[PDB]
Coordinates of C-alpha atoms and ligand atoms in Angstrom, one line a residue:
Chain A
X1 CA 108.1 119.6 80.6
X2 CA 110.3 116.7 82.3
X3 CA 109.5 113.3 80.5
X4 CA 110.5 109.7 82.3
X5 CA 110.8 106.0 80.5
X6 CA 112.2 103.3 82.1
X7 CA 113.3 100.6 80.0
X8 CA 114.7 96.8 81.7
X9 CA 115.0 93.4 80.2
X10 CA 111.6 92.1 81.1
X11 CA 112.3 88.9 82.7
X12 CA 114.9 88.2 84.9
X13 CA 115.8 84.5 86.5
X14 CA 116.1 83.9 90.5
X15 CA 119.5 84.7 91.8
X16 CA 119.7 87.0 89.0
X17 CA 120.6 90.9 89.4
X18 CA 117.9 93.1 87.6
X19 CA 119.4 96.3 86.0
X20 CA 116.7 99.0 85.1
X21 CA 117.6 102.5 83.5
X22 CA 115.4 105.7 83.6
X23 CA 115.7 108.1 81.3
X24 CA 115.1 111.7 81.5
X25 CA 114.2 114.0 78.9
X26 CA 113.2 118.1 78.6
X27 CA 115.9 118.8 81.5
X28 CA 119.0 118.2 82.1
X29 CA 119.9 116.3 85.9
X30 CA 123.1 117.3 85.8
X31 CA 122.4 121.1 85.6
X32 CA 122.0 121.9 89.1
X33 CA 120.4 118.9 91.2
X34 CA 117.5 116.3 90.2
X35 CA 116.3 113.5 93.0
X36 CA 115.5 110.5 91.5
X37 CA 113.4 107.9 93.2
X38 CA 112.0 103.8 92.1
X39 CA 108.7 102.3 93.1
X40 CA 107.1 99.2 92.4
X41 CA 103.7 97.8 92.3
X42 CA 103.5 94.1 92.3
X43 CA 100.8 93.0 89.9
X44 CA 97.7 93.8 91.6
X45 CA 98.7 95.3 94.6
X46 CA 99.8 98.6 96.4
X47 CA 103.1 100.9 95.8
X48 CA 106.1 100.5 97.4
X49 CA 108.9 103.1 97.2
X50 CA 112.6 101.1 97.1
X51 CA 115.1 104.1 96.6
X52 CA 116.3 107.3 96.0
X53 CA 119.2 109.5 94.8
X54 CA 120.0 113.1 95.4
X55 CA 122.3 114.2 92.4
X56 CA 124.4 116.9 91.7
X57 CA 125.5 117.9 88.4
X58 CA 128.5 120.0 89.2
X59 CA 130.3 117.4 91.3
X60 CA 128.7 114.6 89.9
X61 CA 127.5 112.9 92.7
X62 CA 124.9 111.9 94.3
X63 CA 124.0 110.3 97.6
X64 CA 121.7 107.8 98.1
X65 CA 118.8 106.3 100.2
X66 CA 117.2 103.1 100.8
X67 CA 113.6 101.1 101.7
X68 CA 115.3 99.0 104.8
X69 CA 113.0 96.5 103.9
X70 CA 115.0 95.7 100.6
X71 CA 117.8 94.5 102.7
X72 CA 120.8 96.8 100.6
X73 CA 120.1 94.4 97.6
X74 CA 119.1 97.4 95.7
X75 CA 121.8 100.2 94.5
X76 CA 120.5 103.4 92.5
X77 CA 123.2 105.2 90.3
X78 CA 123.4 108.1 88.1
X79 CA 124.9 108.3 84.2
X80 CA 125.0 112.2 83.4
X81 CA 126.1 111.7 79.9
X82 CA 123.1 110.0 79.0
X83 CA 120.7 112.3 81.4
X84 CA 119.9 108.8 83.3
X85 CA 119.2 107.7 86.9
X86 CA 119.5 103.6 87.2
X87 CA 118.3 100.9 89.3
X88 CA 120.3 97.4 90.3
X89 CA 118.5 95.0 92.2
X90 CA 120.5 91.8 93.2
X91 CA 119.2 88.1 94.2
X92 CA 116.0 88.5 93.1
X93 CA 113.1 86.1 94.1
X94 CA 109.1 86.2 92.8
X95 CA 109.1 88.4 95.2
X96 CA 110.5 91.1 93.2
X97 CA 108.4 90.6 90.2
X98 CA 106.7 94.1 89.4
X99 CA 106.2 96.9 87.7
X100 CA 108.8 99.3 88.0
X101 CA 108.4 102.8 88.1
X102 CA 110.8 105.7 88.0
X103 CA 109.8 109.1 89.5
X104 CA 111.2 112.8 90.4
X105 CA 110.9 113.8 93.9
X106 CA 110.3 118.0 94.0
X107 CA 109.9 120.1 97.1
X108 CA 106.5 121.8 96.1
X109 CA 105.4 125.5 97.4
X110 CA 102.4 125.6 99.6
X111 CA 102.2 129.5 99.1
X112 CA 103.5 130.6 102.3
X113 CA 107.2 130.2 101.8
X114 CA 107.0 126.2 103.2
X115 CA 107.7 123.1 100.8
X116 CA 107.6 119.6 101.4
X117 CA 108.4 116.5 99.0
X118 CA 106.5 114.9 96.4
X119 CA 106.8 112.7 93.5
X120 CA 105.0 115.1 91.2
X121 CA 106.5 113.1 87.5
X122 CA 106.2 109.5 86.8
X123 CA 107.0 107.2 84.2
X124 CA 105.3 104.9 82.3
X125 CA 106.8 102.1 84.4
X126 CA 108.3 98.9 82.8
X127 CA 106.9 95.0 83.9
X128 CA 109.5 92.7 85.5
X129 CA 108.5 89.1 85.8
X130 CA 111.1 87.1 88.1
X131 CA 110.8 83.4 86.6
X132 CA 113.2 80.5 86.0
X133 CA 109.7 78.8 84.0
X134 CA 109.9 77.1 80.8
X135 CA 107.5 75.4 78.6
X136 CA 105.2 73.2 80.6
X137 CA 102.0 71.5 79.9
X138 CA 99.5 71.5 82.3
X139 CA 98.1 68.6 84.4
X140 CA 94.3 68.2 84.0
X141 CA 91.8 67.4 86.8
X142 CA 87.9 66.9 86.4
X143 CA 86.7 69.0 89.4
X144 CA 83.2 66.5 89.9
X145 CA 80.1 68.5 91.1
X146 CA 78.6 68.5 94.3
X147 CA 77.0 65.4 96.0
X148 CA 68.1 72.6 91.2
X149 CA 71.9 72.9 89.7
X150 CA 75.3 71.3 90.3
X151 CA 78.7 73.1 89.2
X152 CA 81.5 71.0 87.4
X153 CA 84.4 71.4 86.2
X154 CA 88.4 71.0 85.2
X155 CA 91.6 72.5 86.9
X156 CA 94.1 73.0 84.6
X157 CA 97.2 73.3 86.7
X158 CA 100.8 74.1 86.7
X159 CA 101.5 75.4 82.9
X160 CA 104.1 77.4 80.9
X161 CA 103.4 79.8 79.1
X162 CA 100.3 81.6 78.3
X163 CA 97.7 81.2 76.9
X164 CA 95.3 77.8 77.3
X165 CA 92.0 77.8 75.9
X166 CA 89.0 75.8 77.2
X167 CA 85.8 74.6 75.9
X168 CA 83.1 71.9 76.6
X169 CA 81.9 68.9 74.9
X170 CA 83.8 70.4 71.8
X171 CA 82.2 73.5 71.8
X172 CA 78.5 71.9 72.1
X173 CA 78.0 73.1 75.8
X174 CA 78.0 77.1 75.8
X175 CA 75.6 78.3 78.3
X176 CA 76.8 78.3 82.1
X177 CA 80.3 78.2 81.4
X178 CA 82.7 80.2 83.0
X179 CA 86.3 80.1 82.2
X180 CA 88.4 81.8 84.6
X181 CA 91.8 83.7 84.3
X182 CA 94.9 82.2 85.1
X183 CA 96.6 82.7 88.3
X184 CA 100.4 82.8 88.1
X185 CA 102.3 81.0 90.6
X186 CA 105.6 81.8 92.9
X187 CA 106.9 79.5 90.9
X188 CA 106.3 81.2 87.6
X189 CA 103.8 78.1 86.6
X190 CA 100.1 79.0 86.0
X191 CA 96.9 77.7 86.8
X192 CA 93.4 78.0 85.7
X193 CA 90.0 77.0 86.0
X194 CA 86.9 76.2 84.0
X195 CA 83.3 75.4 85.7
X196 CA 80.0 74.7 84.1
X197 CA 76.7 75.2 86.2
X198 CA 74.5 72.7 84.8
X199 CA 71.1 70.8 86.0
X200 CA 71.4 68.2 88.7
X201 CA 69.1 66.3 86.8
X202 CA 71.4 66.4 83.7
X203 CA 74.4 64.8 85.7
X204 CA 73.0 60.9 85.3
X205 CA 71.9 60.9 81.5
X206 CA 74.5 64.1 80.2
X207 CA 78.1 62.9 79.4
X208 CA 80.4 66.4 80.5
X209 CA 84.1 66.5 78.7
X210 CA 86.1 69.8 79.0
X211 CA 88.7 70.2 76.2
X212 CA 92.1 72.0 77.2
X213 CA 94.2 73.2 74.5
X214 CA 98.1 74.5 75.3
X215 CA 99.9 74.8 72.1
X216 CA 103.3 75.9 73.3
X217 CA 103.5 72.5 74.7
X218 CA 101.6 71.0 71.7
X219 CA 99.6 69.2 74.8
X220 CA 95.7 69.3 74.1
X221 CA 93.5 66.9 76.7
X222 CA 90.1 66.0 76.5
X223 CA 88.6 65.4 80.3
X224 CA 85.3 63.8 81.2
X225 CA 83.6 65.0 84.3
X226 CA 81.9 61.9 86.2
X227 CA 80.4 62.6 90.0
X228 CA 81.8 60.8 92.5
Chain B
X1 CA 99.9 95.1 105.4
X2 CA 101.0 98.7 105.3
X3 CA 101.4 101.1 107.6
X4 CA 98.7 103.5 106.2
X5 CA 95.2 101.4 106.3
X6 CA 92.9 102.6 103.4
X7 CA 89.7 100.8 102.7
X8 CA 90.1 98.8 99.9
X9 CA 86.8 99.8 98.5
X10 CA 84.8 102.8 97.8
X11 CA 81.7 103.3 95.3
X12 CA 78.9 105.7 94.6
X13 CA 76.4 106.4 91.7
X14 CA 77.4 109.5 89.6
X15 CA 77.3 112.5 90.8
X16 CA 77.5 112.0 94.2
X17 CA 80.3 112.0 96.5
X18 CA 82.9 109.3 97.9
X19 CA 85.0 110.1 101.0
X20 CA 88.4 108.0 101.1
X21 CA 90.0 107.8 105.1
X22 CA 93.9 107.1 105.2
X23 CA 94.6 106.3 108.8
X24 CA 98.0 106.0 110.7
X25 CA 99.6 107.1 113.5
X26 CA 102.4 109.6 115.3
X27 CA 104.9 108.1 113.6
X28 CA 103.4 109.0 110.2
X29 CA 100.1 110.6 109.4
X30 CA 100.5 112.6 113.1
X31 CA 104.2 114.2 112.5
X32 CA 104.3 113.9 108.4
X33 CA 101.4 115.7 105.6
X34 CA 100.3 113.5 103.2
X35 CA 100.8 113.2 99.6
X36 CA 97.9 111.4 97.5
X37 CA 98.4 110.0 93.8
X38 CA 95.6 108.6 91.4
X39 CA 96.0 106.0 89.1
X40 CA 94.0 105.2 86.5
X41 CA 93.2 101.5 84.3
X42 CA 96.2 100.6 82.9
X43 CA 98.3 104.1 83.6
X44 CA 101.1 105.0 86.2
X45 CA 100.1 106.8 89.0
X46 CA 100.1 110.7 89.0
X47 CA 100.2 113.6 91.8
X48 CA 96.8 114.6 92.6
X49 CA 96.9 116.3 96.4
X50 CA 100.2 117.1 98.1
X51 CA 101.0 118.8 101.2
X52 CA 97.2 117.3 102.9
X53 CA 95.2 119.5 101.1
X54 CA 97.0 121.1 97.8
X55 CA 95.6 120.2 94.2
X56 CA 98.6 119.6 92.1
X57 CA 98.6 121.1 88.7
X58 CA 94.8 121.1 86.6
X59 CA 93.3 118.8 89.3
X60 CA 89.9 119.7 88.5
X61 CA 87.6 121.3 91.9
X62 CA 85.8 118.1 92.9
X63 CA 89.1 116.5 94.8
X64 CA 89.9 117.8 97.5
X65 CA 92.1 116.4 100.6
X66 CA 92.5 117.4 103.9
X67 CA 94.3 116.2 107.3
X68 CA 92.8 115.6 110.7
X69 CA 94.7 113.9 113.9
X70 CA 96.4 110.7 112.4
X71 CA 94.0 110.4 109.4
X72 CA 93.8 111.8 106.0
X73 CA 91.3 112.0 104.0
X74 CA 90.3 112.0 100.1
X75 CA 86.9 114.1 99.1
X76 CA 85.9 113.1 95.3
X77 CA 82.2 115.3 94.7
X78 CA 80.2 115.5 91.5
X79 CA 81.6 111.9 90.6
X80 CA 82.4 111.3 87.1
X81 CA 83.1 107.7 85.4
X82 CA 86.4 108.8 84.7
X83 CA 87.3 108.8 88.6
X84 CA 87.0 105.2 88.3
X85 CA 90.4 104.3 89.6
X86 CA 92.8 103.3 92.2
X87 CA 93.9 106.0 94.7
X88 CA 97.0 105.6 97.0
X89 CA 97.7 108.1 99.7
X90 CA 101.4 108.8 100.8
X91 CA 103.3 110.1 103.5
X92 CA 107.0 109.5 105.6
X93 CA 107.3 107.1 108.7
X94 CA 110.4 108.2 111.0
X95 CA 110.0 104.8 112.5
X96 CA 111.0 103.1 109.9
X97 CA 112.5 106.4 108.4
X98 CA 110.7 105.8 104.7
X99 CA 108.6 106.7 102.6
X100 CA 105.2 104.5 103.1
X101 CA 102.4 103.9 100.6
X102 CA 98.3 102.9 101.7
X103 CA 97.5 99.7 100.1
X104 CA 95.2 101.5 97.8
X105 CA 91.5 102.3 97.5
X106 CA 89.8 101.1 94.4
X107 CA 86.8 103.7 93.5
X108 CA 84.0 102.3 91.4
X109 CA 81.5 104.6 89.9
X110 CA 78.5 102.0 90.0
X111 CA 76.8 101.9 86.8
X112 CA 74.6 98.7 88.1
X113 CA 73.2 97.8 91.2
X114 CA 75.8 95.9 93.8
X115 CA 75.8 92.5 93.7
X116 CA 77.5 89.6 96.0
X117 CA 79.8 87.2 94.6
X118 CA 78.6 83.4 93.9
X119 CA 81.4 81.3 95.7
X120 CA 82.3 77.6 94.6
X121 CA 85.0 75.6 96.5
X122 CA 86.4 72.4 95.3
X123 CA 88.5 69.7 97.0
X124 CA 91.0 68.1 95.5
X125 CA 90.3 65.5 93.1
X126 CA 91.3 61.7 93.9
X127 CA 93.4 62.3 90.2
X128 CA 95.1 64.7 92.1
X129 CA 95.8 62.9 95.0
X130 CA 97.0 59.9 93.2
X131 CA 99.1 62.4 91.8
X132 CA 100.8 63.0 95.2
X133 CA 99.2 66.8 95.1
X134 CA 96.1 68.3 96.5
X135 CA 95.0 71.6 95.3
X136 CA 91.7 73.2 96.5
X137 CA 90.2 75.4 94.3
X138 CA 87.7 79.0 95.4
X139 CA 85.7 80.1 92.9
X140 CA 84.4 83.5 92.7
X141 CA 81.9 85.5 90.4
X142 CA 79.5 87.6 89.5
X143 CA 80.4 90.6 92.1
X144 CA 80.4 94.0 91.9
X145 CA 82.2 96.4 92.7
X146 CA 85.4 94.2 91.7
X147 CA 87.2 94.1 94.9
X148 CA 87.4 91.3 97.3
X149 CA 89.5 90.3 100.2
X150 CA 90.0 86.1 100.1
X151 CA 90.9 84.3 103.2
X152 CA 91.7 80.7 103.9
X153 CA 91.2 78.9 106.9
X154 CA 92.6 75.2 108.3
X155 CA 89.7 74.2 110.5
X156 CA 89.7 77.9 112.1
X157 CA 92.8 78.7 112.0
X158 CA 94.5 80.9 109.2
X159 CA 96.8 79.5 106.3
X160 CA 98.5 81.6 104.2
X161 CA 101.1 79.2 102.7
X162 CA 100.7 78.2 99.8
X163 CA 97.7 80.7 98.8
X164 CA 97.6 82.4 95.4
X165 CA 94.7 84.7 94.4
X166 CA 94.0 86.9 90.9
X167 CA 93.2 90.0 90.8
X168 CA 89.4 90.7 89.7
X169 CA 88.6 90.1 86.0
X170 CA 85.4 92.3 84.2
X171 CA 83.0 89.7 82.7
X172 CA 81.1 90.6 79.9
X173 CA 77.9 91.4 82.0
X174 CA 80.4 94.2 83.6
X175 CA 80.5 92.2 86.7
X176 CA 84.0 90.5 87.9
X177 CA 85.9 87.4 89.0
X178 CA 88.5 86.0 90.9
X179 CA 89.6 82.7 91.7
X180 CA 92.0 81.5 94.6
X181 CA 93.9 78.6 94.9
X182 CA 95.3 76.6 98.0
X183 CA 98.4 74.2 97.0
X184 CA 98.9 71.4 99.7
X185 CA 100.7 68.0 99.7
X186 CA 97.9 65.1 100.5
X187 CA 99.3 65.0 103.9
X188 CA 98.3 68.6 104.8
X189 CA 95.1 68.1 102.9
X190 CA 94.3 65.1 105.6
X191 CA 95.8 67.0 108.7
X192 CA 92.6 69.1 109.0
X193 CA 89.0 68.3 109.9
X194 CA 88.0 71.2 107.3
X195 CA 89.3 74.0 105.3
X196 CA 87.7 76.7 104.3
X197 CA 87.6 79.6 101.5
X198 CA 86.7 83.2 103.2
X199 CA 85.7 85.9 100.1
X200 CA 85.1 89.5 101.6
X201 CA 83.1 91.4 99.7
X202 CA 81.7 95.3 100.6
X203 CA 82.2 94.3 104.3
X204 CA 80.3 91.2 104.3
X205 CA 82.3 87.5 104.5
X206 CA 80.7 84.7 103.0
X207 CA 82.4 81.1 103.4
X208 CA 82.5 77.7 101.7
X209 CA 84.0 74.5 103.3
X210 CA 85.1 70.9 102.6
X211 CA 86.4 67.9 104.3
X212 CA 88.8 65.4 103.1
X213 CA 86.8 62.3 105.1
X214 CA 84.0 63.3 102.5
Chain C
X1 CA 124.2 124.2 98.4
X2 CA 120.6 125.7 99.9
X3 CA 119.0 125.8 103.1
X4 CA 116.0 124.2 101.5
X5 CA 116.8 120.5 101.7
X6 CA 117.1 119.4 97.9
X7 CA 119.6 117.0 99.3
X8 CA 117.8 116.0 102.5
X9 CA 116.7 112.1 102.5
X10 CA 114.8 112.6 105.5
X11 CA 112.3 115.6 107.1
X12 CA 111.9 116.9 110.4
X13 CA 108.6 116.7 112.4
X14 CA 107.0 119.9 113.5
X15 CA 109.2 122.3 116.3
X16 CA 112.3 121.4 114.4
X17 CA 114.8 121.6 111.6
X18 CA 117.8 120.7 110.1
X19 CA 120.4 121.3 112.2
X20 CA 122.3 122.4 108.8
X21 CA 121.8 122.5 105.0
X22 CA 122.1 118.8 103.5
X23 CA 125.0 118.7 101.2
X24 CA 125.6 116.3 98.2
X25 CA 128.4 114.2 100.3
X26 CA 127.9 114.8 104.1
X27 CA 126.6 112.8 106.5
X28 CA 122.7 114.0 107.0
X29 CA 122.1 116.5 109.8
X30 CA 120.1 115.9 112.4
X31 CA 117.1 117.1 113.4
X32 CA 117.4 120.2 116.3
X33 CA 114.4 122.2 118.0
X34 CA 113.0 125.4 116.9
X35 CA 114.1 128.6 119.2
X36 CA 111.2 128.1 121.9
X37 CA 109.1 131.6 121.8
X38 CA 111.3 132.5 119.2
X39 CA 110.7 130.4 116.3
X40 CA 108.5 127.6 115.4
X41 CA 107.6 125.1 112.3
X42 CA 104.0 124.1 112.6
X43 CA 104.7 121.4 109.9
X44 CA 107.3 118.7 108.4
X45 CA 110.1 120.0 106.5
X46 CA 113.1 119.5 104.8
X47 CA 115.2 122.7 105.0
X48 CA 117.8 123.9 107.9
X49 CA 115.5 127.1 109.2
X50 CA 112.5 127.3 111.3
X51 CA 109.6 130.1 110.8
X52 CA 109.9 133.8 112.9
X53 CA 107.1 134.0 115.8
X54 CA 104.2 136.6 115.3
X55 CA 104.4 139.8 116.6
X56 CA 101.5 142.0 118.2
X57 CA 101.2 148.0 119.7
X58 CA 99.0 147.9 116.5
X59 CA 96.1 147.8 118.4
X60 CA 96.9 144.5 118.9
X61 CA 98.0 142.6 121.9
X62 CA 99.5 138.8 122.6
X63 CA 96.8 135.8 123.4
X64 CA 99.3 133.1 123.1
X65 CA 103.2 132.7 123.3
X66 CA 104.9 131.2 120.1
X67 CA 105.5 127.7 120.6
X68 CA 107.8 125.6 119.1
X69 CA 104.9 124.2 117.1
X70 CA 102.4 127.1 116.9
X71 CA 103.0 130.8 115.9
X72 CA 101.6 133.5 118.5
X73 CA 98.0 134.3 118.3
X74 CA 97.1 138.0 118.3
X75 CA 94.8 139.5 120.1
X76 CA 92.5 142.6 120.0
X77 CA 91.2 147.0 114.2
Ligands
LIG1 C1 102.2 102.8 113.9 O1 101.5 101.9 113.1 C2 102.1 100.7 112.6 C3 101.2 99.5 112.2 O2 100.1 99.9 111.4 C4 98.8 99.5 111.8 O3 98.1 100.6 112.4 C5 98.5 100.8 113.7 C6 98.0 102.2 113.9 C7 98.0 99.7 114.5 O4 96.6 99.6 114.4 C8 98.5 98.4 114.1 O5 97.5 97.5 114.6 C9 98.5 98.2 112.6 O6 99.4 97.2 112.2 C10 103.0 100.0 113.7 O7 103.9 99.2 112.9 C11 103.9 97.9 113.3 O8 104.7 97.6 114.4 C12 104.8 96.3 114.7 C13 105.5 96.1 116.1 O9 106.2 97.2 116.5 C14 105.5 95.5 113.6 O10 105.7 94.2 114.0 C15 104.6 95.6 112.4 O11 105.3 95.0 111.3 C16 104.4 97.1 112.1 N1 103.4 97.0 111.1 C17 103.7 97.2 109.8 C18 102.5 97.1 108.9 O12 104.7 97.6 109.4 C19 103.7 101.0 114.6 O13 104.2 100.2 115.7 C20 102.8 102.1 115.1 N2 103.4 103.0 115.9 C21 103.1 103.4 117.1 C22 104.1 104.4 117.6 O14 102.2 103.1 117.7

């Protein structure tokens, strides 16, 4: 009944080391032997393993093993007194930002006397967002539609934090729009978009205003959407 | 990309089957079995085949895994909604002496009819540029499954600085977006004759385009 | 402190084997071949020992040697 949590600060700034912890419970790793390894999954994207330690409880020590592709910034260590396996991580970049997970490697029976490795417990994983960002308000840009329909619309670019809100003609305009999620940035900034599909026709006589709200700035713009 | 190539995209109807490929090489997947993990919305990934073809503990009959040559291979029958999920196959590489991850199949249990995304691409807006910034902006909805591969292109060349892409987003009619954004100074925006948003979708690349002399 | 490779970072590829059990706080062993026709590991593995060939007599005969890869196959109850 082996149980894993990992626990870290959250964010982290560039430069910065990130130190993770991952603690075991319903065994003890310092009883006989317990191999410990990290992965991360960037938000969005795959798994990627970034170490491991071998531990032994009677001498406790444990060697160690490393993704070469982390370029020895990471370091995995073991604290038996507190039945946990730890994770440094030195001169992070956006690069680094992820969800961390910690795992137990075991060498599983295939019935016929053979074994070979998997990473057969998992914890939950904890999010670690490499960002220097603070509060920003976004710059606005009427996105004009297209020289039956024409799409419009408003960038909202470069902002800090989450969330922004969006509407249209002050909530008058409903139908067509599509607000989309944010992406965020390398450089921990985000940016989203909203675009209304409305009748070509409409684009002469119809006045078009977007309405972009970011209260952690205490920034709210009103843009009006002209062709061009 | 890694190592292991895995489709990024699998989908049935319930009930029938779904076949996942993992392919490698003799470095990997030809010396080394393979390990494969499930993870579902929101959860941490968990041990579901080991060994090629071993069900880990209460995997239920329908998965199954096996190993041929350099490629493994995930079998999910009788397909549920639950399987809905991402499923990453595993194994070492004694090249680069590691352990290496595919990049992950979504599966999609399709509980409406496929349906190709709607693309929109803007240029950047002359507020922008007088702004001393250009961003070009790739809209994308209404697709389904939600999984899409988004390329850019300088006339017909590839760019891949500056690029930034969300993940896909459910929209209320169960469909999804994405949006991707290109982030160039004015004078890169005016060094092309065209760029161009590429969005993938089930094997099939659609492509909008725009030109800064227009 | 077993030949089973709890402390082994790394596997060997089929027809081999840790040249010696992985310890805590010695440099990993090597990978060495099988005994050719003697014994064999069809499959990755971790630990310091490879698998005894088949034997065949009982009614049975050899059809193929033991290979560093392969076990014998029997023959003809
Ligand atoms: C084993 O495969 C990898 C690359 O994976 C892919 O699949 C291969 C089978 C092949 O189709 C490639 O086109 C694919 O990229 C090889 O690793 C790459 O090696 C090159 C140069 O040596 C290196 O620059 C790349 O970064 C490696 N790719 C990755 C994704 O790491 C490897 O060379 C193949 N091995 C053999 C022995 O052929």
């Amino acid at each position: 009944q082996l149980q894993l949590q990992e626990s870290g600060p959250g964010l982290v700034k560039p430069s910065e080391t990130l130190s993770l912890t991952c603690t075991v419970s319903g065994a003890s790793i310092s009883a006989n032997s317990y191999y410990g390894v990290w992965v991360r999954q960037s938000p969005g994207k795959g798994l990627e393993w970034v170490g491991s330690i071998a531990y032994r409880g009677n001498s406790n020590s444990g060697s160690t093993y490393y993704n070469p592709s982390l370029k020895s910034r990471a370091t995995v260590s073991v604290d038996s007194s507190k039945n946990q396996v730890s994770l440094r991580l030195t001169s992070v970049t956006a690069a680094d930002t992820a969800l961390y997970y910690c795992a137990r490697r075991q060498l599983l029976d295939d019935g016929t006397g053979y074994q070979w490795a998997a990473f057969d417990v998992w914890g939950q994983g904890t999010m670690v967002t490499v960002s220097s960002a603070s509060t920003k308000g976004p710059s606005v840009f009427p996105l004009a539609p297209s020289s039956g329909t024409a799409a419009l619309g408003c960038l909202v670019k470069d902002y800090f934090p989450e969330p922004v809100t969006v509407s249209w003609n002050s909530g008058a305009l409903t139908s067509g729009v599509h607000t989309f999620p944010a992406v965020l940035q390398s450089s921990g900034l985000y940016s989203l978009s909203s675009v209304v599909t409305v009748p070509s026709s409409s684009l002469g006589t119809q006045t078009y205003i977007c309405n972009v709200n970011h209260k952690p700035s205490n920034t709210k713009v009103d843009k009006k959407v002209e062709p061009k | 990309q890694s190592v292991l190539t895995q489709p990024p995209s699998v989908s049935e109807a319930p009930r029938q089957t779904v076949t996942i490929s993992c392919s490698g090489n003799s470095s990997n997947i030809g010396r080394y079995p393979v390990n494969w993990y499930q993870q579902l919305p929101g959860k941490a990934p968990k041990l579901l085949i080991y060994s090629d073809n071993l069900r880990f503990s209460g995997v239920p009959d329908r998965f199954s895994g096996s190993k041929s040559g350099t490629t493994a291979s995930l079998a999910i029958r009788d397909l549920l909604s639950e399987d809905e999920a991402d499923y990453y196959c595993s194994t070492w590489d004694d090249t680069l002496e590691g352990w290496v991850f595919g990049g992950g199949t979504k599966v999609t249990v399709l509980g409406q009819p496929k349906a190709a995304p709607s693309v929109t691409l803007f240029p950047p807006s002359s507020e922008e540029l007088q702004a001393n910034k250009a961003t070009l902006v790739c809209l994308i909805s209404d697709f389904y499954p939600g999984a899409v591969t988004v390329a850019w292109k300088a006339d017909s060349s590839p760019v891949k600085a500056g690029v930034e892409t969300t993940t896909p987003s459910k929209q209320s009619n169960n469909k999804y977006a994405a949006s991707s954004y290109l982030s160039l100074t004015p004078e890169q925006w005016k060094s092309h004759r065209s760029y161009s948003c590429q969005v993938t979708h089930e094997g099939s690349t659609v492509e909008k385009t725009v030109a800064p002399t227009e | 402190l077993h030949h089973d490779g709890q402390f082994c970072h790394k596997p060997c590829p089929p027809g081999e084997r840790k040249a010696r059990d992985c310890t805590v706080n010695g440099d990993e062993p090597d990978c060495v071949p099988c005994q050719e026709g003697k014994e064999y590991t069809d499959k990755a593995h971790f630990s310091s020992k490879c698998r005894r060939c088949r034997l065949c007599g009982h009614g049975l005969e050899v059809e193929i040697n033991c290979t560093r890869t392969q076990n014998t196959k029997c023959r003809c109850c």
